[PDB]
Amino acid sequence: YNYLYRLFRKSNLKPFERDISTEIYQAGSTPCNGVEGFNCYFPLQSYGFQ
Amino acid sequence: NCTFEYVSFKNLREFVFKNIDGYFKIYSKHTPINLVRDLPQGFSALEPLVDLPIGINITRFQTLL
Numbered sequence: 401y402n403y404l405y406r407l408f409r410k411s412n413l414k415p416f417e418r419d420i421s422t423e424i425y426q427a428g429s430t431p432c433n434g435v436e437g438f439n440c441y442f443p444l445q446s447y448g449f450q
Numbered sequence: 451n452c453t454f455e456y457v458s459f460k461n462l463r464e465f466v467f468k469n470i471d472g473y474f475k476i477y478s479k480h481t482p483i484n485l486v487r488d489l490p491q492g493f494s495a496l497e498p499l500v501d502l503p504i505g506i507n508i509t510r511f512q513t514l515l
């Protein structure tokens with residue numbers, strides 16, 4: 401679980417752009433305001449390699 | 451963090467800074483001047499100094515003095 405990728409972002413990267421920001425992403429009407437829920441998600445996720 | 455490091459009126463001193471594809475690029479020039487009321491008309495082209503692989507977004511800046 402040490403390896404991660406970004407599953408959510410505001411907009412696509414420019415060439416060689418790098419981004420460490422961890423803030424909760426909003427995908428719809430729900431005001432997420434720092435917590436997960438329906439259309440509210442933590443942006444970094446793991447492959448869980450087995 | 452702390453991911454990169456490098457070490458290298460009488461005058462008008464002139465600089466240019468620009469960022470392209472996550473590279474960051476600098477140019478400059480230095481000259482004597484006759485008068486200080488406004489920028490003096492004429493030519494003295496600026497020349498490159500450094501080109502840094504920063505991989506960072508820049509939208510604001512400030513002078514340190």
Ligand SMILES: *[C@@H]1O[C@H](CO)[C@@H](O)[C@H](O)[C@H]1NC(C)=O
Nearest residue numbers: 410411414506507508509510
């Ligand atoms: C840099 O990040 C800011 C804040 O997210 C954003 O407004 C800006 O559009 C980004 N820079 C460029 C060149 O798009």
